[PDB]
Amino acid sequence: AGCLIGAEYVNNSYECDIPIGAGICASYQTQSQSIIAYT
Amino acid sequence: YFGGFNFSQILPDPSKPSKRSFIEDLLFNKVTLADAGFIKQYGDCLGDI
Numbered sequence: 615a616g617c618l619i620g621a622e623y624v625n626n627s628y629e630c631d632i633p634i635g636a637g638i639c640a641s642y643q644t645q646s647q648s649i650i651a652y653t
Numbered sequence: 654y655f656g657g658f659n660f661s662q663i664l665p666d667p668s669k670p671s672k673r674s675f676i677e678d679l680l681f682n683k684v685t686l687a688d689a690g691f692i693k694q695y696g697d698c699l700g701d702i
């Protein structure tokens with residue numbers, strides 16, 4: 615759904631916090647807190 | 654084995670990468686979709702042919 619700048623991808627899976635696009639969600643997590651994007 | 658009932662057509666098969674059934678394959682091939690913005694078609698729109 616475009617491309618994301620500022621959020622790092624992680625190889626994990628949680629429930630959806632912020633819906634981005636086709637199976638991608640984003641969250642504010644500690645894994646120094648930052649913004650991560652996952653499936 | 655489910656008591657003689659054949660569920661081989663609606664259960665998924667690991668042969669194809671998209672884990673869909675036979676009837677789901679027929680239902681997906683029957684409807685002609687007009688895209689959903691998945692491949693980011695602005696790059697092909699820039700290359701006008």
Ligand SMILES: *[C@@H]1O[C@H](CO)[C@@H](O)[C@H](O)[C@H]1NC(C)=O
Pocket residue numbers: 659661662
């Ligand atoms: C019915 O079941 C048999 C074995 O359980 C299988 O070989 C066969 O392919 C099934 N029928 C269909 C139409 O898939």
